[PDB]
Design an enzyme around this catalytic site. Structure first.
Site, mmCIF file in Angstrom:
data_model
loop_
_atom_site.group_PDB
_atom_site.id
_atom_site.type_symbol
_atom_site.label_atom_id
_atom_site.label_comp_id
_atom_site.label_asym_id
_atom_site.label_seq_id
_atom_site.Cartn_x
_atom_site.Cartn_y
_atom_site.Cartn_z
ATOM 1 C CG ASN A 173 -2.420 13.492 1.337
ATOM 2 O OD1 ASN A 173 -1.566 13.105 0.889
ATOM 3 N ND2 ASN A 173 -3.813 13.607 0.666
ATOM 4 N NE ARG B 293 4.790 3.554 -1.588
ATOM 5 C CZ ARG B 293 4.034 3.117 -2.394
ATOM 6 N NH1 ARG B 293 3.716 1.944 -2.094
ATOM 7 N NH2 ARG B 293 4.055 3.646 -3.768
ATOM 8 C CE1 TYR C 10 8.627 15.461 -4.444
ATOM 9 C CE2 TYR C 10 10.872 15.154 -5.742
ATOM 10 C CZ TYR C 10 9.525 14.667 -5.118
ATOM 11 O OH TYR C 10 9.157 13.224 -5.426
ATOM 12 C CB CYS D 229 -1.082 -0.009 1.030
ATOM 13 S SG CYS D 229 -0.373 0.446 2.800
ATOM 14 N N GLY E 295 5.860 11.411 2.006
ATOM 15 C CA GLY E 295 5.160 12.375 2.111
ATOM 16 C C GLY E 295 5.646 13.567 1.426
#
Lengths: 260, 260
Positions: A176, A165, A208, A145, A167
């Site tokens: 979210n 897993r 990023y 998942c 973010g």
């Protein structure tokens, strides 16, 4: 009693100072920390972040889309995709024909199951729904998942923990937080419970490279009180909710930040 | 730089002060908090808790048993059980005959897959192995895991996050910290990485009513420096490890506390 958003901002500050360089799938650079967690109260407020304007309209519309179980890209405005976070939430494991097909009673309905378990055994430690990144599904047998959502009930309050897993802290995380808080509000509503906490846990929490300067500016901003979320009608089944049923009140965000 | 065990002790103190009464499966009472997380460094030390003596011999022997994929209760000293945390780690989804049968190449080998992915793509955000409580397996279609273990690699260090849907703070948690830290050490070893962090996340973090007084006493104890874990031999495959290969050094615990 510090504002909940100070957790998000400290996590950002922590990844900027202490994150390690690490590349994603596409070879695009991030700064990364493994393992993070934050807790947002859902009691008489709603954690829609205020240090930038969060796209609430998109949050709501995409959640309602997921709840429909749709694989019609065009049904969502903010094309047969096969399985996506809806088909897995409502039709988990059923053999997929096309997006127009009738999947009623086919596969596991993870979402209805969560709601039915809340109402049959609120103590259950197993009230869990998972979502998969569509691209993983044909890659291997029994793929992991992307996200696991665990619900918890005590004293007539419903809490939710989302474990992802990975973010994307600049774009995906604020979005979210609002999305799972909203899901918790909807489920609490139909089960006659009060929303309690939303807890957000991550594996690879990353920024990023191209988001560093906008986030550094975001960090100079002071959070305002969170808004309130009001559901305008008595709603009975999770499928019955409409965008019209929800009103965000007292939302006073700092300006939009474009990331990316 | 505070001792890592201070996290465990503060979590205990938090559940005693702020936990809500909530019953488990059997109607036995707990004090419960939803959503917790702690981080233990694995760098030049090993998080074997020191405010009580943790049953290291049992930790090691049961982990080696799980790694064998055994369903032979008698093979473990610290009987056909069907599927258990071993058969699911090594033979995930394979149709189970009996404990003596030959399951080679049958089902998904979640553990070998983690190791192979570490060595083929260390950046992968999908390095995930799950375990199920055996009793859930016949209860429903697609039952939820009890525990999800995510690995993460950066700078030649291997970290591990264990998410458990519930955690018995008095008995199970200290034991699982040591168990997953040990698994991380073994995997790091065979993949030529250095252990990094172990991160432990919980859903329903609870203290059984009958453990309150012993934990209140445990809280009066000051942690000693963590011990070191040395692997005594160069080991190539995860199946090759033996209890003989491991030496805990400098372990100076406070006395055993019996909970239950």
């Amino acid at each position: 009693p510090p504002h909940g958003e100070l957790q998000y901002l400290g996590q950002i500050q922590h990844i900027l100072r202490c994150g390690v360089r690490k590349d994603d799938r596409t070879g695009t650079g991030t700064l990364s920390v493994f393992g993070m967690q934050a807790r947002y109260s859902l009691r008489d407020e709603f954690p829609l972040l205020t240090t930038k304007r969060v796209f609430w309209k998109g949050v709501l519309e995409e959640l309602l889309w997921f709840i429909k179980g749709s694989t019609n890209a065009k049904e969502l405005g903010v094309g047969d995709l096969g399985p996506v976070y809806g088909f897995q939430w409502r039709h988990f494991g059923a053999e997929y024909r096309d997006m127009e097909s009738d999947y009623s009673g086919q596969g596991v309905d993870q979402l209805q199951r969560v709601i039915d378990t809340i109402k049959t055994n609120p103590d259950d430690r197993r009230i869990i729904m998972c979502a998969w990144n569509p691209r993983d599904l044909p890659l291997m047998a029994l793929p992991p998942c992307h996200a696991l959502c665990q619900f918890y009930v005590v004293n007539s309050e419903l809490s939710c923990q989302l474990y992802q897993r990975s973010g994307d802290m600049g774009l995906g995380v604020p979005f979210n937080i609002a999305s799972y808080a909203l899901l918790t509000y909807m489920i609490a509503h139909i089960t006659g419970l009060k929303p309690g906490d939303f807890i957000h846990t991550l594996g690879d929490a990353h920024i990023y490279l191209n988001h560093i300067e906008p986030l550094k500016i975001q960090l100079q901003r002071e959070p305002r009180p969170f808004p309130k979320l009001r559901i305008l009608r008595k709603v009975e089944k999770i499928d019955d909710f409409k965008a019209e049923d929800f009103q965000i009140e007292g939302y006073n965000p700092h300006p939009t930040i474009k990331m990316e």
